[PDB]
Design a protein around this ligand. Structure first.
Ligand SMILES: O=P(O)(O)OC[C@H]1O[C@@H](O)[C@H](O)[C@@H](O)[C@@H]1O
Ligand SMILES: O=P(O)(O)OC[C@H]1O[C@@H](O)[C@H](O)[C@@H](O)[C@@H]1O
Ligand SMILES: O=P(O)(O)OC[C@H]1O[C@@H](O)[C@H](O)[C@@H](O)[C@@H]1O
Ligand SMILES: O=P(O)(O)OC[C@H]1O[C@@H](O)[C@H](O)[C@@H](O)[C@@H]1O
Lengths: 479, 479, 479, 479
């Protein structure tokens, strides 16, 4: 419900991230009438392009119906492109002049989407700060990963940026925080009683945060290798999920009241020991099809003799009254058997058994994807003419209960949040700090010693050794 | 055993319950092959008849298909009759010899199902103990309601019967104890941790035990006018469900280990008080359907100026560490807006609301019928581009999950139990005693003071004063 | 406050238990005006004595002040002695005639104190039942240990007695149940909130029931040897304490409502494994004085080459929701360093430590004796100009708070209880059963294998090995 | 450090607080050898004086003994004076050079203790920042109350001061935070398990924070008439204790980790409401003692028709998971029946009473003064031959347990802290802000509406309406 004019600046428009995620995503929001009326889109890159060009290369990506022709015409009518250089100050001054010329560009709120490489980040933020900033309206910078590789590399940038911009201006992206069920963890936990008395070490045996992809690095091992999986999905995604699951109740649903509690949790976490860790690497599958018979080292982009993991099983620990002793198992990997992002709370066994070991540990499962759902695995009396216990479940499936309700992409809701000034779902400075504090030591070690990752066949569940790190830590599987 | 010869004596075989429930039930158990091979069905009554007549008057209750014309012959081929009076030892010595004439009759196991009026209960048990008893096998007597009009009344009956038979011989019936969801209560709470720590005064705001029928006294309100709704459905059915919901975890799934926990709960339920009771008597709905246009008094089988309650709402309190203070609402009525039998726990509101009053109390619901299911009404984030909390639920509906499966009749399963020697789901002497100690003082006040029940329209929900009573004690209703 | 005439029959009056415990104890109650007015005392034994004789040998034991001369004269005026035989029926008939002659002896309530050997028990109960029983007043039998040695030996007597007498007539003695603080466990636990939320496996690390005597078998090893310490103090005393500490809350403080819960607890206890057990035997102390330099085998009454324990450390386990997993450590012994009977609850460590391991496990201590007290060991800020934590305590000492209040001997209150018809502090049949069920297997084993008990110097704390059975089981000592 | 040179500048040295509290305090710290070796005491004021005068007017407050006539010389040998005005930069440039003349003055650590009126607070901080500041060592400013009359008033002061100094430089004082038992709160709850799980809404019925003085406005009610009881003792003292009792367990015993938890609790305390407040103003007791015969208005220093409250009772609510619903009673008054400062938690009644209403609510009491102690009022079995429950208590009285030990003054310890650099026990900006946000709305209503305080006799307990208010909210009182 805004009247303020808006400028959405996509830095690196000729890019692939902007051309296939950012542009299309902002189209979806323009179409669905989710953006303020007076909103302009400006793309900025070296390549000397026209709005005819940006459209030609992006439209194949808008998933547009011929009934939207008019809305498309209207969207691009509000689009412009400014060719400029990334480390040049005059190019940036032009960008600014262009914006001021836009209708009310002077008082408009500027939203800068950094769709560039991190190698560029500093130059761009330093340059935007000087030239490209509004003085009447607010200015906000949308950032993304990676936010460094080391704790030193990140604090290096965190501080550079933190010196020109405030935190109420920085919006760092962890798209998982834009995911429906991930976002649901808060209401589920804090709006429900049935899930309160049980949310502790007293009742929970262990917690599992799972990341699974059926495919692996796809002829793109080059970029990956310098990254590993931990730095790729663990330090960010998996960890964020953990927070929302372990954090205490905030004073409010307020942006920075919530974030404090997330940091509070990361601070109760001691460092990952290389004894509770289990790395793996994907070798090919001789009995498969296509890319499936190709290992990771079977990639030319892939350095010759890599100790880089494409699978990691890790046990973290939240040292406080609520979780003191409860193992948090973060199991992430590519080249696995399926696509799954989920949170799982395996509850302890019941005291005093009158059912003769017939019962199986209860479980709360939040399936981020696919098939959005929150279900409770428990025991029921075997239906019919039987008296024994049986494993059953109470479910909430978005597919049946909420058949005809579209769940938005993380970007749509996350971009929309930057338009609203809602940082609650964006990573905060101190958060990154703590995330690096935990993994940095381990990630370093993996570099000095360069351990040999356990191999696993493409389409497998990963290295068996991880499963044992699980049972050893307190996980029971039968069911 | 499952090789042993059994005789199933149906006393009052010409009756309507015999010919409409017992006979048709015993045959299904037969057809579905649940009864033991060597079982014989002997009917005993006055009306001198032939197994041929019996077939004709009960056969339109068999729910049988043409495909099973022979099994019925197989069935009726194990049937017999023995005409006699209920207090003539000549007739009984006849019933005996008859069974003694059956193959291994003298060595068999005997099941006396009593399908007679409670006036004959006295005489029959005697003569059964006097003549028709086994010396080689077991003897069990199935007694059905009603078990007396008052604590003193029931004491008379119970004492007589127990003067002749032991408790492992007495099978008191309450079919609700043979209903699927009702039996599932035990396993639901004691087999799961997810439901353990919320099951107490600290988390539960109140418990509501509901019983409703869309119909009324179908042309026969002269029988009921003697008993009333409380005696009819509350003292027995509703009270049993409260026992299962309220009881402590037993030492084992054993009969008198479970039945002990049941009686123990009743023992700490103080007597009901009229200032915690709402009585209703239905009237007709002129803008009505058919049978609805007629209320209780619009039946001549029903005496004049009757003040008999066709609806009751009673608040009970279980005084103990677990339930001290939690109200147990017992709402039972006839001629309402629906046919439902369910257990429902309304939990307290979460402490420290961060969601601005938008939050509704959680609820565990166990619908005994219809559509057998157990679900938890909870709060989830409004799905889509919304952050506010919305009411949803996690369900375990049997119709979907267990489409295939066949949920048996309460009598099919209950009767089958008398065969295995399971008293779990049969009312004990003490239990029955405790249940009368609770309701008598009030039942008496109603016969003495003779208050005028609040009228309520046929199809309605009953007197609003019932809803008011619910509020006053803690019940929080949506709207 | 009774008018009923009373007869207190001391069977085995010339005995030492009657002459030094029973007689004097009943004198204390007569004096303090605790007995009914019309109360007669009859002593029964083979020895042909007069009330002049019984007095001469007992008075040295009454701890009487010359100001009680008159009360003494009055006490013995109400005393009589009947010489008779233990297995003769005429001797018993005389006893009866004597009682009927006492003023209103016919309608008087008879209380039979079995101050005899167990070798006699049966003969006496069988004989009393026939002759010596009132028909107008109640009759009660006061029994004592041992109640058998095996579960079979006890069930043997339990049943003999149980066949002539009801349980509401049997009063079995465990003098520890007559001890102030032991009796206090109920109020402490069930009348206080501060001791509720903490009384569970969630908070309690372990429980310790301690029995200690500074002296050992005193030239009386003969009687002891056939007994051991387990059968002597563990199966009874220590176990009873455990019950009162582990039992759930009863429906009332009622005699048999309380006892049910005690049995309930013993039934959740699985058998003592010889792996969690630690026996010991006391060798002498070459650097001591008097009996202190004498071992146990240094007793001639002591069989030549004994494997009999005078010290036992045992870990029991209550398998239920409250104590599931919490080790119950029963540590009993003679020839130890001190006299102590106490209950101790060591609580778990606090989660999330901001004090740097400066804190010591909390502890609830109930000291049965000496120095009656219930105190709470916890942490305080070091008093004065310090900020660190320090171990301190909150105490309730009967010596200061209740300076001038006499705490009675177990016998006075326990005997008085038999006069009131209060069985709550007397062992019940089913209880003995369960106690034997646990230890019988272990006690047997110790007989077949005849293991060599670890030796320990008179005045020691016992075998070090027990201390480790402690830490291993979860006990921390520093403080 | 403990080798570093320090200067202790006492601004307003001729004042009564200086000469009566600060000087005598600083010397004890000196004599007891707590101050660092190289410490200098520089007095600054108007009245042109000599260290000689200062000695004579403060020396009768030294609590000194003849045995220490020399230490005082050692003390006064480190004393200096600097006459000047409070808003003349000439006088200040004098104060400086003076310290610069002291040994290592230019390199020293500086402590500006402000013993002046709040009118001068503004000017002084300025000039201290303008001239009298160090460049080599640390500068800390000790500000005492009052910190403004309203939220707006305090915002003015806080903002000025913070415009010059940082928070690690500002030391706001509340001596109650330097009292033994008050400081022990932290360790009492967070260092023990015995007090952890009962510390919540589930177990606590209510919290009562008490402050009383047996005396009144001793001849000086013109100063107080401007402020009132709430501003005087509740907003500060009482509120701080509630913070410590109510706060969540901090991440560490660190200043702004603890101070964070304090502010967090205040942040969820809604503003007070008049319908939850009782105001009293004392009158004289004719059957009186001496000074008692005179009430507030019977003093001419006190304006006429004054409606200033000399007693207040306020109910607050901390809206959160832990305390939601629990009432925090703030009872503070002058001219009562005693001098007491204590924290008290009244627990709920146990569920399922098996002791027949004889049971009283348990209570954890922490008496700050007098007779520093912490005890728990509980129920124990009436000692002796009784079975009924009686009220007793487990105590930790410092007078007995720590006879020997010396509990220091709040200022002795507090001041010593400014020396170590500990702000734990010093009020932060936000805290102070939150504390005014809570009481302002009401303070204003009192100045606007000007209600007439309920009179109460000198020596009494205050208005009964206060006791009534306590009841209504849950307070259960014996009798
Ligand atoms: O889970 P989603 O939304 O498919 O996204 C997963 C991707 O998230 C990215 O952040 C990771 O870098 C990818 O390696 C990963 O595959
Ligand atoms: O729920 P069900 O099995 O139909 O049972 C309902 C009937 O149960 C009987 O016990 C009552 O006496 C009837 O009045 C009632 O209608
Ligand atoms: O603990 P108390 O009252 O001294 O009694 C302890 C005695 O109790 C007896 O039951 C035991 O048989 C003795 O061996 C033991 O010493
Ligand atoms: O409890 P203490 O240390 O004596 O403090 C009491 C005094 O504290 C002061 O803060 C109040 O302004 C005085 O009015 C009060 O008398």
């Amino acid at each position: 419900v805004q009247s303020d004019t808006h400028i959405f600046i996509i830095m690196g428009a000729s890019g692939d991230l902007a051309k296939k995620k950012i542009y299309p995503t902002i189209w979806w929001l323009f179409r669905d009438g989710l953006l303020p009326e007076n909103t302009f889109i400006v793309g900025y890159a070296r390549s000397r392009l026209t709005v005819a060009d940006i459209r030609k290369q992006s439209e194949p990506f808008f998933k547009a119906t011929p009934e939207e022709k008019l809305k498309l015409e209207d969207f691009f009518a509000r689009n412009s492109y400014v060719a400029g250089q990334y480390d040049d100050a005059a190019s940036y001054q032009r960008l600014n002049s262009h914006m001021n010329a836009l209708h009310l560009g002077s008082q408009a709120n500027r939203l800068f989407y950094l769709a560039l490489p991190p190698t560029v980040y500093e130059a761009v933020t330093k340059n935007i700060h000087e030239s490209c900033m509004s003085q009447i309206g607010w200015n906000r910078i949308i950032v993304e990963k990676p936010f460094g590789r080391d704790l030193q590399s990140s604090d290096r940038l965190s501080n550079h940026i933190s010196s020109l911009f405030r935190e109420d201006q920085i919006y760092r992206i962890d798209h998982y925080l834009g995911k429906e069920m991930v976002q649901n963890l808060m209401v589920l936990r804090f709006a429900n009683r049935i899930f309160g008395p049980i949310w502790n070490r007293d009742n929970i045996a262990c917690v599992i945060l799972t990341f699974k992809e059926p495919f692996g690095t796809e002829g793109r091992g080059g970029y990956f290798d310098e990254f590993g999986i931990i730095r790729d999905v663990m330090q960010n995604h998996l960890l964020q999920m953990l927070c929302l699951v372990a954090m205490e109740k905030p004073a409010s649903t307020n942006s920075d009241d919530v974030r404090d509690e997330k940091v509070k949790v990361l601070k109760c976490i001691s460092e990952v020991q290389a004894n509770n860790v289990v790395l793996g690497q994907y070798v090919g599958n001789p009995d498969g099809e296509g890319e499936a018979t190709k290992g990771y080292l079977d990639d030319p982009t892939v350095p010759r003799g890599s100790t880089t993991a494409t699978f990691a099983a890790v046990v973290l620990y939240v040292e406080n009254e609520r979780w003191d002793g409860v193992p948090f198992i973060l199991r992430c990997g590519k080249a696995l058997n399926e696509r799954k992002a989920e949170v799982r709370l395996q509850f302890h066994d019941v005291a005093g058994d009158i059912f003769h070991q017939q019962c199986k540990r209860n479980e709360l499962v939040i399936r981020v994807q696919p098939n959005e759902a929150v279900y409770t695995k428990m025991m029921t009396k075997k239906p019919g003419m039987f008296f024994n216990p049986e494993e059953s479940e109470l479910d909430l499936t978005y597919g049946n209960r909420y058949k005809n309700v579209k769940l938005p992409d993380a970007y749509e809701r996350l971009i929309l949040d930057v338009f609203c000034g809602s940082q609650m779902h964006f990573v905060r400075s101190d958060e990154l700090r703590e995330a690096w504090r935990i993994f940095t030591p381990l990630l370093h070690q993996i570099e000095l010693e360069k351990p040999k990752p356990i191999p696993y066949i493409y389409g497998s569940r990963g290295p068996t050794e991880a499963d044992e790190l699980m049972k050893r830590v307190g996980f029971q599987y039968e069911g």
